[PDB]
């Protein structure tokens, strides 16, 4: 009980200290996976507003092993030894898809861009407002206002 509360407290200080990576890590620890999910949806929202994922020098070191460039030597020894097991590639895989989604749009790989967005939406953890945001930003203006796709009765039904 005492330990879990301290973790919650750490997260509040870390948010203040503008160490965005470290606050989520602390909430994970607090035993509140549900809250972890809620900041994930919010981070997706943030990443949409930026048009692309955030880059901090600490963030550059962890993520680099699935991202070109970005390997920046001389970040604390705790950060470097922890990540060696490749646990980060798995945990980062849903954010990575989002980030890759913008990339594919810009690369005029509009077919595949649609595919990644659909995969993310199918996960039932979205309730009705992390849906309102996506359709007006991406699905309706870019992909359904333009005709370039052949549908049929069933494909329409599923929609």
């Amino acid at each position: 009980e005492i330990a879990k509360e301290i973790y919650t407290t750490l997260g509040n200080q870390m948010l203040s200290a503008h160490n965005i990576i470290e606050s989520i890590a602390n909430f994970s620890r607090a035993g509140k996976y549900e809250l972890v999910k809620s900041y994930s949806w919010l981070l997706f929202e943030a990443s949409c507003m930026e048009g692309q994922k955030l880059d901090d020098p600490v963030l550059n070191a962890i993520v680099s092993k699935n991202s070109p460039a970005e390997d920046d030597v001389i970040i604390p020894q705790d950060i470097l030894d922890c990540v060696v097991t490749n646990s980060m590639r798995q945990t980062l895989a849903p954010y990575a898809v989002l980030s890759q989604f913008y990339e594919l749009r810009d690369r005029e790989d509009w077919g595949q861009a649609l595919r990644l967005l659909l995969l993310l939406i199918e996960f039932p953890y979205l309730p009705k407002h992390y849906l309102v945001l996506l359709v007006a930003k991406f699905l309706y203006p870019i992909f359904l206002l333009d005709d370039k796709k052949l549908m049929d009765e069933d494909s329409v039904a599923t929609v």
Binding site: Y33, K37, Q90, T91, A93, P94, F123, Y125
Partner: peptide, 25 residues
């Protein structure tokens, strides 16, 4: 993706459990 899906499923199961607990209340 697999990990994320698993986590989501776990969360959903937790929610179900909570609902059942309240259902009995």
């Amino acid at each position: 993706s697999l990990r994320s899906v698993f986590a989501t499923s776990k969360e959903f199961d937790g929610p179900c459990q909570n609902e059942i607990d309240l259902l009995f209340s």
